Amino acid sequence: TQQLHAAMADTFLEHMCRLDIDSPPITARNTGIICTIGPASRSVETLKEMIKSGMNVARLNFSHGTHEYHAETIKNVRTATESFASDPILYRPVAVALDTKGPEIRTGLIKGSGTAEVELKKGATLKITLDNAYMEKCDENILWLDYKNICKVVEVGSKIYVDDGLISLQVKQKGADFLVTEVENGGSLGSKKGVNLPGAAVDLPAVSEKDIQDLKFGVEQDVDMVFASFIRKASDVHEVRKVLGEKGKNIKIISKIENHEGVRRFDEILEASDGIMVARGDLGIEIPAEKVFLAQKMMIGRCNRAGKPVICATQMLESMIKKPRPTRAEGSDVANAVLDGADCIMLSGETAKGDYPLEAVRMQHLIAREAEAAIYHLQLFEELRRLAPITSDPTEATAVGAVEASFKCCSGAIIVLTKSGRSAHQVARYRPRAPIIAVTRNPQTARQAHLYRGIFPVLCKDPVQEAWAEDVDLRVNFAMNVGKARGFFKKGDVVIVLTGWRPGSGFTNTMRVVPVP
Amino acid sequence: ADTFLEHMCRLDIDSPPITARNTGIICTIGPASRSVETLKEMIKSGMNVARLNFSHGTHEYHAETIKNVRTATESFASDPILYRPVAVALDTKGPEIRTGLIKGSGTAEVELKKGATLKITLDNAYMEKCDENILWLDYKNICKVVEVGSKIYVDDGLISLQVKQKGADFLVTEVENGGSLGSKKGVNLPGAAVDLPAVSEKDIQDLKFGVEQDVDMVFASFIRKASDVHEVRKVLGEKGKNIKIISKIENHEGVRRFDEILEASDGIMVARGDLGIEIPAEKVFLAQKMMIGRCNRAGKPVICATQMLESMIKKPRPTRAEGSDVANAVLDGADCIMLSGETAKGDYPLEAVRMQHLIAREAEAAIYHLQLFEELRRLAPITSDPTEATAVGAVEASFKCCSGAIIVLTKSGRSAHQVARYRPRAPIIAVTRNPQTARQAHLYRGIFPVLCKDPVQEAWAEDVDLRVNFAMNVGKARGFFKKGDVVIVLTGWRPGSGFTNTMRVVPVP
Amino acid sequence: TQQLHAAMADTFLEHMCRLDIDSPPITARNTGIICTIGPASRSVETLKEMIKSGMNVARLNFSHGTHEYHAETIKNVRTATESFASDPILYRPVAVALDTKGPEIRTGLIKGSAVDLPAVSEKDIQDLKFGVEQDVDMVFASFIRKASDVHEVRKVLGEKGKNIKIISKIENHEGVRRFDEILEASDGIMVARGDLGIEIPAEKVFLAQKMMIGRCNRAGKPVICATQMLESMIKKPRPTRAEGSDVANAVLDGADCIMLSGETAKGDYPLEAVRMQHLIAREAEAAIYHLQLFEELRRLAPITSDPTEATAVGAVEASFKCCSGAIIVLTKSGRSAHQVARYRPRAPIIAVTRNPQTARQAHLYRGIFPVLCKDPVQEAWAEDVDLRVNFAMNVGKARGFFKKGDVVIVLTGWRPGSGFTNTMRVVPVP
Amino acid sequence: QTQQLHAAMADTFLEHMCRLDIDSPPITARNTGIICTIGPASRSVETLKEMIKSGMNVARLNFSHGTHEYHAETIKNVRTATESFASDPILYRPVAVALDTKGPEIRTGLIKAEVELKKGATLKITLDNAYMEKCDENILWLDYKNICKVVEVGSKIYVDDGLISLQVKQKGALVTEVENGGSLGSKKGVNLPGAAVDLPAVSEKDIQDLKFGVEQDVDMVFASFIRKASDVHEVRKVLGEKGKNIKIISKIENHEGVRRFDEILEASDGIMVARGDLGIEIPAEKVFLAQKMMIGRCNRAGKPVICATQMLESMIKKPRPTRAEGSDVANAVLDGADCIMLSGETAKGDYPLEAVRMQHLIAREAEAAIYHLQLFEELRRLAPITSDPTEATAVGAVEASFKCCSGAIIVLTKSGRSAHQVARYRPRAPIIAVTRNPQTARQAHLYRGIFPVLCKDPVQEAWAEDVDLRVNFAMNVGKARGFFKKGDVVIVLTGWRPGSGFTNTMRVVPVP
Numbered sequence A: 001t002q003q004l005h006a007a008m009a010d011t012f013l014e015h016m017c018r019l020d021i022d023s024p025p026i027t028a029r030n031t032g033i034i035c036t037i038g039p040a041s042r043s044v045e046t047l048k049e050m051i052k053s054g055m056n057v058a059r060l061n062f063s064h065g066t067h068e069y070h071a072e073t074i075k076n077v078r079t080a081t082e083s084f085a086s087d088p089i090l091y092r093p094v095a096v097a098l099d100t101k102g103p104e105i106r107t108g109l110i111k112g113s114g115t116a117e118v119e120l121k122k123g124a125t126l127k128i129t130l131d132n133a134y135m136e137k138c139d140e141n142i143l144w145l146d147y148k149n150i151c152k153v154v155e156v157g158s159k160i161y162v163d164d165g166l167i168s169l170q171v172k173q174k175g176a177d178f179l180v181t182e183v184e185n186g187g188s189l190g191s192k193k194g195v196n197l198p199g200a201a202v203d204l205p206a207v208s209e210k211d212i213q214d215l216k217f218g219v220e221q222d223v224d225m226v227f228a229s230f231i232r233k234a235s236d237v238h239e240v241r242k243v244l245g246e247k248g249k250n251i252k253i254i255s256k257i258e259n260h261e262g263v264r265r266f267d268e269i270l271e272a273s274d275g276i277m278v279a280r281g282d283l284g285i286e287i288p289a290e291k292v293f294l295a296q297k298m299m300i301g302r303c304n305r306a307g308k309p310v311i312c313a314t315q316m317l318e319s320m321i322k323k324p325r326p327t328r329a330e331g332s333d334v335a336n337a338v339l340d341g342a343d344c345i346m347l348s349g350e351t352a353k354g355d356y357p358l359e360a361v362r363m364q365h366l367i368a369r370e371a372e373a374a375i376y377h378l379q380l381f382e383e384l385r386r387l388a389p390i391t392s393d394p395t396e397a398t399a400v401g402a403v404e405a406s407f408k409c410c411s412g413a414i415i416v417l418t419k420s421g422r423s424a425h426q427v428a429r430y431r432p433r434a435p436i437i438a439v440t441r442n443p444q445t446a447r448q449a450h451l452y453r454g455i456f457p458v459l460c461k462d463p464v465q466e467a468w469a470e471d472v473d474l475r476v477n478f479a480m481n482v483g484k485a486r487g488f489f490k491k492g493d494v495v496i497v498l499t500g501w502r503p504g505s506g507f508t509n510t511m512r513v514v515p516v517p
Numbered sequence B: 001a002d003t004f005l006e007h008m009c010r011l012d013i014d015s016p017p018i019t020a021r022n023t024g025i026i027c028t029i030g031p032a033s034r035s036v037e038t039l040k041e042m043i044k045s046g047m048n049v050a051r052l053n054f055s056h057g058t059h060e061y062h063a064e065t066i067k068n069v070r071t072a073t074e075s076f077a078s079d080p081i082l083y084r085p086v087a088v089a090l091d092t093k094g095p096e097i098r099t100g101l102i103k104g105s106g107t108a109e110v111e112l113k114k115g116a117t118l119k120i121t122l123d124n125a126y127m128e129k130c131d132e133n134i135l136w137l138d139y140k141n142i143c144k145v146v147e148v149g150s151k152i153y154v155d156d157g158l159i160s161l162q163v164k165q166k167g168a169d170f171l172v173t174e175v176e177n178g179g180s181l182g183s184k185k186g187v188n189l190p191g192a193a194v195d196l197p198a199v200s201e202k203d204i205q206d207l208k209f210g211v212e213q214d215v216d217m218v219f220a221s222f223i224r225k226a227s228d229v230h231e232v233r234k235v236l237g238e239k240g241k242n243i244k245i246i247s248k249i250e251n252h253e254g255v256r257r258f259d260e261i262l263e264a265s266d267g268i269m270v271a272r273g274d275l276g277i278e279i280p281a282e283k284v285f286l287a288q289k290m291m292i293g294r295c296n297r298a299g300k301p302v303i304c305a306t307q308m309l310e311s312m313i314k315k316p317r318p319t320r321a322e323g324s325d326v327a328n329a330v331l332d333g334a335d336c337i338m339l340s341g342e343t344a345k346g347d348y349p350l351e352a353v354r355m356q357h358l359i360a361r362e363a364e365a366a367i368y369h370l371q372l373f374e375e376l377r378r379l380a381p382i383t384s385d386p387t388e389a390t391a392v393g394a395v396e397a398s399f400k401c402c403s404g405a406i407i408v409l410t411k412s413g414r415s416a417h418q419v420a421r422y423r424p425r426a427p428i429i430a431v432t433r434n435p436q437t438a439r440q441a442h443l444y445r446g447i448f449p450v451l452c453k454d455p456v457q458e459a460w461a462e463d464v465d466l467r468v469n470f471a472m473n474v475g476k477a478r479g480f481f482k483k484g485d486v487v488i489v490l491t492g493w494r495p496g497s498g499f500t501n502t503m504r505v506v507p508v509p
Numbered sequence C: 001t002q003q004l005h006a007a008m009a010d011t012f013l014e015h016m017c018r019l020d021i022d023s024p025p026i027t028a029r030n031t032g033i034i035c036t037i038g039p040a041s042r043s044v045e046t047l048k049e050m051i052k053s054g055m056n057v058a059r060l061n062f063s064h065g066t067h068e069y070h071a072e073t074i075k076n077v078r079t080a081t082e083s084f085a086s087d088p089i090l091y092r093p094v095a096v097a098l099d100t101k102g103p104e105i106r107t108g109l110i111k112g113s114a115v116d117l118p119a120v121s122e123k124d125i126q127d128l129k130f131g132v133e134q135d136v137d138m139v140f141a142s143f144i145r146k147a148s149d150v151h152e153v154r155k156v157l158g159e160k161g162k163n164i165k166i167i168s169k170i171e172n173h174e175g176v177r178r179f180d181e182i183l184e185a186s187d188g189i190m191v192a193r194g195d196l197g198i199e200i201p202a203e204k205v206f207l208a209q210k211m212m213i214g215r216c217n218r219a220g221k222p223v224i225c226a227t228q229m230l231e232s233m234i235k236k237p238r239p240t241r242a243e244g245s246d247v248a249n250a251v252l253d254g255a256d257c258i259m260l261s262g263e264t265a266k267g268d269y270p271l272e273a274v275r276m277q278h279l280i281a282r283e284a285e286a287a288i289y290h291l292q293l294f295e296e297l298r299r300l301a302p303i304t305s306d307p308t309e310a311t312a313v314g315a316v317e318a319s320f321k322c323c324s325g326a327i328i329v330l331t332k333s334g335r336s337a338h339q340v341a342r343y344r345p346r347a348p349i350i351a352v353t354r355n356p357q358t359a360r361q362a363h364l365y366r367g368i369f370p371v372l373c374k375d376p377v378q379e380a381w382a383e384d385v386d387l388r389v390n391f392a393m394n395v396g397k398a399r400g401f402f403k404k405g406d407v408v409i410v411l412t413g414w415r416p417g418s419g420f421t422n423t424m425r426v427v428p429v430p
Numbered sequence D: 001q002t003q004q005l006h007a008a009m010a011d012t013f014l015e016h017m018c019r020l021d022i023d024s025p026p027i028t029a030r031n032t033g034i035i036c037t038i039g040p041a042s043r044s045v046e047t048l049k050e051m052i053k054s055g056m057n058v059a060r061l062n063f064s065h066g067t068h069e070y071h072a073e074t075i076k077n078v079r080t081a082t083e084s085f086a087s088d089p090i091l092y093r094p095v096a097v098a099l100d101t102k103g104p105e106i107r108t109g110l111i112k113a114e115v116e117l118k119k120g121a122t123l124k125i126t127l128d129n130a131y132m133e134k135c136d137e138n139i140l141w142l143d144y145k146n147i148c149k150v151v152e153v154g155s156k157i158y159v160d161d162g163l164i165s166l167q168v169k170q171k172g173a174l175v176t177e178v179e180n181g182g183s184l185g186s187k188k189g190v191n192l193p194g195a196a197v198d199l200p201a202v203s204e205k206d207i208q209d210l211k212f213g214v215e216q217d218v219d220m221v222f223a224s225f226i227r228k229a230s231d232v233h234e235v236r237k238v239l240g241e242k243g244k245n246i247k248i249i250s251k252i253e254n255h256e257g258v259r260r261f262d263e264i265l266e267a268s269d270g271i272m273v274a275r276g277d278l279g280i281e282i283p284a285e286k287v288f289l290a291q292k293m294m295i296g297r298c299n300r301a302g303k304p305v306i307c308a309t310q311m312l313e314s315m316i317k318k319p320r321p322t323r324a325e326g327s328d329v330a331n332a333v334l335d336g337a338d339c340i341m342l343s344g345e346t347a348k349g350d351y352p353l354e355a356v357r358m359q360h361l362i363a364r365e366a367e368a369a370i371y372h373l374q375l376f377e378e379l380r381r382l383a384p385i386t387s388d389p390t391e392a393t394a395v396g397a398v399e400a401s402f403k404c405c406s407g408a409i410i411v412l413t414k415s416g417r418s419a420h421q422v423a424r425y426r427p428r429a430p431i432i433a434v435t436r437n438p439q440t441a442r443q444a445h446l447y448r449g450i451f452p453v454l455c456k457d458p459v460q461e462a463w464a465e466d467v468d469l470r471v472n473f474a475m476n477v478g479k480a481r482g483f484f485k486k487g488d489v490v491i492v493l494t495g496w497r498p499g500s501g502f503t504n505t506m507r508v509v510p511v512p
């Protein structure tokens, strides 16, 4: 068959026994792919080849680089995207996302050099002086950190992790100026590395003065979304929404869960956020590493029940930084993220600094296409419906009804006509197997649609005819030509179209089953 | 609500039902229910279909019933907003076997005793002279089928007979269950296979009579093969090719070949009268649930027929068993429930129709819809018909917003049939200009028919909204929804038939 | 072919479509049969005919009748019961029950529609205390309204009659609302559709039946659906089509026993009605969705930390896996057998016992076939336990339940006494 | 709550995922076996003693390298380090010894030492029996004299873990075009993902290799490169009479062994999804499909599955695993794996102890988050109605243990099958198996949820005080290991006469 022999079972155990590797995919990719842009992927020549490989969102990590650096790669990103803006049938939009530095704590300058590297010995002594004079004179005896209140959160007998938590220190003697530490498992040290204090209440603002600069800078560059790092409560997401103000009212706020406080208040944060990012990098240091998988599936399942997007984040094909092929564990982590119900998957250092930025985006596209097919659609569509509440919205009743018609006639796609994208988000939350072709006039809506799994946005640049009925039916024939060209369906097939009864947002209420012309 | 057991533990008797009765009621017209005066009170009490039993009656007598029923339907039918169609059904005679007259007058009776002896004879001399010693039946070849271990039953299976000897004419018998033997009583022969055809020459004239009277359906009695379903369809011809055929299973062969007859018919009637005598009586409940379940899987109507409220022939209140029978027939999934002797000759006709309406809408309000709609979709295939996908997608939205009803514009009713296949909780309003299809709509559960009276407008798009606004007038008046309730409307893209696609969620104006 | 083709369907809808009338049932009937003894069944020779036809417990209505006649019917019921006592293998205990008159308020011929009447008057206390002297096994306390009434009855029968189980008959609107407080206070509930169909509207006497049967099924207590189920059989030798489906659906809904009132007391066809009920209930038992009832009975079941409660659930699970012939249980008070029946197995539960009152009382529960062992007690407790096991095997082979070679499940214990059932073993029939 | 009980009482797979809590600490013991390969980083006795304290259950010897004398000292040091704890049998942990055959592998020759290759140059493969000790960046040499008759113009050969792969442009000698480009070293592995190689699964070198394990009393065999059931037949025939009870594990590493899996599973005692060589013979984006399919079919058949290579690969150079490597082993035991493995992480790594402990903590947390309410239901629905009395006891023992929430299920067994039949229905409670057979105690590490304990006391006379002796032996081991307290209810399974195959009676006894 073609994936369809597995999804036709009465038990979850038999569904696994029917997973055939001789069954190829057929539909398009439903999981968006976010790649981090860096010095290995900044030229317009490579940025164009990434779009032809599967990239949908360009991420800029503002933990490094100056504004002139990020303004250049933004201009380079947009340049390589309009490289295909000629034919509007094959043109694929991509989005630009800003990543916050947040309440980060770093170390000083190792002997006044940005490339120096001291060597901690297994079991040596280390002093952590809160003074200033050694911020450019860091040797294998004294360490300088920029956290002023490091003494007002730690005590004698605490753990301290530096640079991705690879080296660890224990506090023996703790004064008020410094704190004597012993290397519990050391190695190579470096300059400006991140330090983690698991088990302490760090009182950093989580919306500092540097965050105001890059947020205001991001509004001026017209970015589509923001990844606020280290969100600990709903108060912080509210602080982000106020800083963006009226100029940035239409950009999406995605909260990065990275510490124990944010996990304990996930329901608090989700209700105030537009999306969630499972940032497993920092999260794996503040909590035990063996518990990360429990927190991941917990957040994917909760936001799936609310219809809000979540991303899987760092270290998915990390070995591909120095190798053209990933490892067996990495080939399964991406597959098991789509199966959990993730909306997008992300690449960080794999596309920013690695030696094979293209083959990493190619590998993610291959695995996600296979994982989307072997999804138990009988159990998923029933559970999400049974847990969904009774609604008075006509759009939601049309949305859930269109997905039932989608599974009934085994349709090729679901054409939805929206302007803000809200009518398209309500269809994707019920996860139809058929792709959702959301035709829009709003270029921002076309870029922001990459966050809700199943949506394939197309942007129509035609003028508007006088007869509204002719303008409505004009957007549908565009989606028929786009789907027929890209290989989604052929003439004679059956698709589902979603329209409304009046112009303006919030009126999608008619569903028609139309044959493909 | 997740379990079947807790659903039963949560049944409340102080929570009255709402909506309306979705299960249809078929009543048999007889000497006690024949006047145009009483027939007007049967429609007001819950009647939907009129059945004429052609087992005894000439064509002149039945033409008066049809002329009387239609007089009562279109009687106070000046308001189409409150007009309820009433269908007409013809029950075939079939290969019946009757006895002879007792001592010269159907009125006399003899007293048979257990362990005594009786003789059966086909010699037509004894015809109007059957006594307690010699019995006559109109089955000529009643000897080439029954062996020396046969078992004959007379008068609703109440008098048993054991065929001791046999021969050519005669057959010696020993009475097993005695009683009062009358004249012209029915005879049932279990085990043996009858040689009389299911479509006799007397039935051929009975069927051509129905084509000329504009009858909506026929109830063919005693069907064993699908060839029997083909003989009736042939004589109905192209002039009556639109009437629906409802096959009756009353024998062991018809049940053993039910799958064959289901594909060669439009509907099914579980005629439990003769069926309870042909097979063991304790096995009838197995056969009823098997047929209703198989037809629900296919979308064809079923009817539960005889002795539902049998006590109501003499008494004005039914027994506890008859109450738990009508309700358990709706919980089984029957499309309609019937009355026979309760309305044809009993002393309480409208009183039994009221009771069968009280219990039916009480059972619909307790149906476990959560796992019924789920199981129906899981066993129905993926079709290419765009109407099937529009139908299954419309009633799924009917559950999401707790819709008031589902308005469907149908010409031949085939659209509304596909909607009712999945059994939503909301009522299905069907608007049509075809009176035959508005009468034939009670065969399917949940479809409330409404016939339109206004002429066709010039603009077709204006013709659709004229009928959509009519169904909400019949609904707001009857009490199906109020001002501001979300409902489901179903239409198509072009005039004609077979183009239903469009589904619109709209509030009541 | 006990309708096992339908007992393996994936959906409940498909389970109906597999019901084959040509699939004969097993030889064991689980639903109890209760007959009301009257002028048409007071003989000692027809009462022997009502045995071997299906009667399990004889109901004696006390709304009219004197103690001299009631004790005479009790005298001949026991006479026709010990008729077969000249065979410990084929013998079958028969119980006796007392339906108290209660607050009837007649004016010469029944009829009538708070009543302010007591739960038990002087005529009730005398009739109730009369059952203690006559060794009745169970009482049908009529017209209960609250737990106040069930307690006011258990007090008048004090110490000599404590093991006698009371059965609350729901008959009015009060008990329909205060059902839960009357359930936990009683030992079993009877659904009297006759006296209840007049009070509540007729069109609703089926939601109350199904609701009461399921709640008692959940809690694990007996339920009985009683009056007019074969009413036409009083004057006619055949039942109607509606009556045959009434008894069938009653067994399907989950009733423990079915009752007959006027059909056996005053009527022309008494022995015939006792056989139609046996024929029907044997067929409705084969057409049961065991795959859904057992999983739902356990899903709502608690986490009772009783060692005997856990071995019961495990024994019913071990019987479905091997298609066993029966579940053998050694019990002294029936409680060990009442817990294996709570989870509704398919095989019969043969309960061996020496207590004769527990054998007669085992008819209140579904699927329990009690047999009484008359052999003397052995000096070695081990040889005495394995003796009652072999006695149960020969009984099953005689009544045609299994053959030398089939598998059975035996429940025994670690210590002589009561409340120590914790040993389950799978052994082949020798 | 604790032990993730909140997620267990759910009614949907979705809501069960939202109720997962990280403040719900695991309470039960670890129910997943651990296999670590021994090498220069873990060969010494003192380092071997620490690996047991960390949770090592099976020591695997890899026979693609090393001599017979080299492996003989490895088996000696393993056995020496484990009876270091045999003083008190109330805390002794058994340990199995696994055999991994070299099998049919093709490897290149020496060079000149590495030589880079271009993105589109030419390399002529030479099968000349020159025994190339000099292979420059043009002319390579293999030891497979059949690649000419097993490939055609347009084929593909992978070199060095599938890092460098060429295409078969022309033929007749073996000219090829570099379709990848890398650094080719001396004596590297080669993979031919196509036609059938005529190399024997049991080659002359492996015949003396399997006989060596029979003479050394190994406990299991990891047959490398199994494609047909005749291979599992031929391997069992080579073990012969002396090694009758050695469990054969067939490694699925190519496309033939996957298309004939039902044939190989029915003829083997177990399976291992060797994701290493398999990710080269098949597309890397499809190995996850084969992983979940092969696990689900053994759970349906009651046989063990091992997930093998590259589970914690980064722990070779760093002391902490990547967040993608922590999710791999958690989903592995969530898919139904019986044991997890480590290859180069314990043989030549720099942090071997930290790898064993990391695999221990993850599996313990992941076993607590298993949806048993659906797992136990589907396991019975697909298991057929057998009339094996020992099968009905096990299904009844697990059903009873869920009703009373037993702390353990004590099972006595002489061969192991009694405990294996209980484990196949996946009880949440740990299965305490008691036996006097050391081999049966060591092999029981292959079945998920079995805690083997060896009884060294002599056999008593009366068959009554001797059964209650071994039941109390599990009672004290449970109280010592902190499984339950004096007063809790347990499930004890026993027979009716000495000997195997009489597991029939189940008892619910209180802990004294």
Ligand SMILES: O=P(O)(O)OC[C@H]1O[C@](O)(COP(=O)(O)O)[C@@H](O)[C@@H]1O
Pocket (backbone or CB within 6 Å): A417, A418, A419, A420, A421, A422, A423, A424, A499, A500, A501, A502, A503, A504, A505, A506, A507, A508
């Ligand atoms: O998704 P939203 O923002 O509610 O918008 C959907 C709306 O789009 C509309 O097509 C409005 O039409 P225009 O965009 O062409 O004005 C209506 O179909 C519907 O109300």
Ligand SMILES: O=P(O)(O)OC[C@H]1O[C@](O)(COP(=O)(O)O)[C@@H](O)[C@@H]1O
Pocket (backbone or CB within 6 Å): B409, B410, B411, B412, B413, B414, B415, B416, B463, B491, B492, B493, B494, B495, B496, B497, B498, B499, B500
């Ligand atoms: O007869 P069917 O198959 O039920 O279809 C009903 C038809 O009614 C329509 O609404 C048009 O009917 P009219 O021609 O009477 O206006 C179509 O959309 C549809 O094809």
Ligand SMILES: O=P(O)(O)OC[C@H]1O[C@](O)(COP(=O)(O)O)[C@@H](O)[C@@H]1O
Pocket (backbone or CB within 6 Å): C330, C331, C332, C333, C334, C335, C336, C337, C411, C412, C413, C414, C415, C416, C417, C418, C419, C420, C421
């Ligand atoms: O049903 P009950 O009253 O709990 O009986 C259970 C008892 O029966 C036994 O099997 C044996 O009872 P006896 O010693 O009285 O013969 C015990 O194991 C157990 O305690």
Ligand SMILES: O=P(O)(O)OC[C@H]1O[C@](O)(COP(=O)(O)O)[C@@H](O)[C@@H]1O
Pocket (backbone or CB within 6 Å): D412, D413, D414, D415, D416, D417, D418, D419, D493, D494, D495, D496, D497, D498, D499, D500, D501, D502, D503, D504
């Ligand atoms: O597990 P196996 O090998 O099938 O046999 C287990 C048997 O061993 C027993 O422990 C008794 O045999 P032993 O003589 O070895 O103690 C019983 O519990 C059981 O019948």
